[PDB]
Scaffold this active site. Structure first.
Site, PDB file in Angstrom:
ATOM      1  N   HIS A 167     -12.954  13.064 -11.548  1.00 25.07           N
ATOM      2  CA  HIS A 167     -11.612  13.246 -10.999  1.00 25.07           C
ATOM      3  C   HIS A 167     -11.083  14.615 -11.398  1.00 25.07           C
ATOM      4  CE1 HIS A 167      -7.168  12.197 -10.557  1.00 25.07           C
ATOM      5  NE2 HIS A 167      -7.702  12.119  -9.349  1.00 25.07           N
ATOM      6  N   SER A 176      -5.718  16.573  -7.091  1.00 26.30           N
ATOM      7  CA  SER A 176      -5.316  15.164  -6.934  1.00 26.30           C
ATOM      8  C   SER A 176      -4.167  15.117  -5.932  1.00 26.30           C
ATOM      9  CB  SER A 176      -5.013  14.551  -8.293  1.00 26.30           C
ATOM     10  OG  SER A 176      -6.150  14.578  -9.114  1.00 26.30           O
ATOM     11  N   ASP A 223     -14.912   9.843  -6.019  1.00 24.37           N
ATOM     12  CA  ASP A 223     -13.704  10.189  -6.750  1.00 24.37           C
ATOM     13  C   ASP A 223     -13.133   8.962  -7.475  1.00 24.37           C
ATOM     14  OD1 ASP A 223     -11.431  12.501  -6.801  1.00 24.37           O
ATOM     15  OD2 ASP A 223     -10.573  10.482  -6.796  1.00 24.37           O
TER      16      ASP A 223
END
Ligand SMILES: C#CCOc1ccccc1CCCCCC(=O)O
Ligand SMILES: *[C@@H]1O[C@H](CO)[C@@H](O)[C@H](O)[C@H]1NC(C)=O
Length: 343
Positions: A289, A145, A245
């Site tokens: 994610h 991330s 995503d």
């Protein structure tokens, strides 16, 4: 378990001035080192950093960090959970700078918060050299991330730091997971580009040198977007990116009629296009994610090849391979058209 070490240079701090640090599990005999950058969004002005300090304080301070952390996924030492690098030296670097790992600014009388992500990475690397990193053959800088974007922003600086320190034999590489975003049009309008642009000013954020020289003053926000910064990098970087995503969809205000169907299909096609000339990449058609520190990261496959296998094939390529691919991008155009997507 990985054991916490707070930085001996206590001027390298989390947002609130507390020492930054790292969790370490050494593996004697192994010459591979995996340094993983945690993610967790960011904050871009005083008011919203104050809000983050109320309810996300562990992402801004080390005062409540636990003494240990279990290594999971690529940080696991069990071959069954981590077929790739289970015997490696494992480092988990907590994200406590709220700056996508770009800042180099101390807390002072003019700054309520310190934003030192870029310096935190450098200091961790520096202090690790005395704990065995000096003997490494490969340093894999990984991250998920905001940590995955942080890999792209810092991998060449780590390689340069080790070169200037007299360790030219350590091969520095990058593994950017769920950090490859598009500065695209929102599905419904009111955005990353401005928040990042304001963030950089607020953090005194730094970007890699070649990308900074292309886009020049005021336009450094461009270097936070994978498809723009990646071609400027000299270190090998493996890109892991879900085609759909969840963080991308969030900032795009996507939460199915034709307009949204076309928007989603175009988003996947655009992501696919940005990865066309990325030789080491793993990009499944899933709505999800992060992946690499998930315990079941071994489960997803693209064209029959798992991410752990793709990473091993990448290792072999850095010594095309028969039956060992490294470029794995789904072509199907809708989330979960890949049957191995996480439920
Ligand atoms: C589009 C979009 C997301 O905006 C960004 C754009 C470019 C670089 C970094 C970011 C923020 C990353 C936040 C990811 C979520 C997390 O860290 O959990
Ligand atoms: C501590 O960190 C700061 C910020 O990177 C640096 O300027 C200073 O030289 C460091 N001191 C030592 C002793 O490493």
């Amino acid at each position: 378990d990985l054991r916490l070490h707070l930085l001996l240079n206590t001027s390298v701090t989390c947002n609130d001035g507390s020492p930054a640090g790292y969790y370490l599990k050494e593996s004697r005999g192994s010459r591979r080192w995996l340094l993983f950058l945690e993610g967790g969004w960011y904050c871009f002005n005083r008011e919203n950093c104050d809000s983050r300090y109320d309810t996300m304080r562990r992402l801004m301070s080390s005062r409540d960090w636990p003494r240990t952390r279990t290594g999971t996924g690529i940080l696991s030492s069990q071959p069954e959970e981590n077929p790739y690098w289970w015997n490696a030296n494992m480092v988990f670097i907590p994200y406590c700078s709220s700056d996508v790992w770009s800042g180099a600014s101390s807390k002072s009388e003019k700054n309520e918060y310190a934003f030192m992500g870029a310096l935190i990475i450098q200091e961790v690397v520096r202090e690790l050299l005395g704990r065995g990193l000096s003997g490494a053959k490969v340093l894999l800088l990984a991250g998920s991330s905001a940590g995955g974007t942080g890999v792209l922003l810092n991998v060449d600086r780590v390689a340069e730091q080790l070169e200037k320190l007299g360790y030219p034999a350590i091969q520095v590489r990058g593994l950017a997971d769920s950090g490859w975003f598009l500065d695209n049009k929102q599905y419904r309008h009111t955005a990353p580009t401005e928040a990042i642009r304001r963030g950089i000013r607020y953090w005194n954020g730094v970007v890699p040198e070649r990308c900074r020289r292309q886009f020049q003053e005021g336009e450094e926000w461009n270097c936070f977007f994978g498809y723009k910064v990646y071609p400027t990098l000299r270190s090998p970087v493996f890109v892991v990116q879900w085609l759909f995503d969840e963080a991308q969809l969030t900032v795009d205000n996507v939460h199915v009629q034709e307009g949204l169907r076309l928007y989603i299909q175009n988003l996947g096609r655009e992501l696919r296009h940005t990865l066309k000339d990325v030789p080491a990449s793993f990009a499944p058609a899933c709505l999800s994610h992060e992946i690499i520190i998930r315990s079941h990261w071994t489960d997803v496959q693209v064209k029959g090849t798992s991410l752990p296998r793709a990473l091993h094939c990448w290792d072999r390529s850095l010594h095309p391979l028969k039956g060992c691919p490294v470029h794995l991008v789904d072509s199907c155009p809708w989330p979960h058209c890949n049957p191995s997507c996480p439920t």
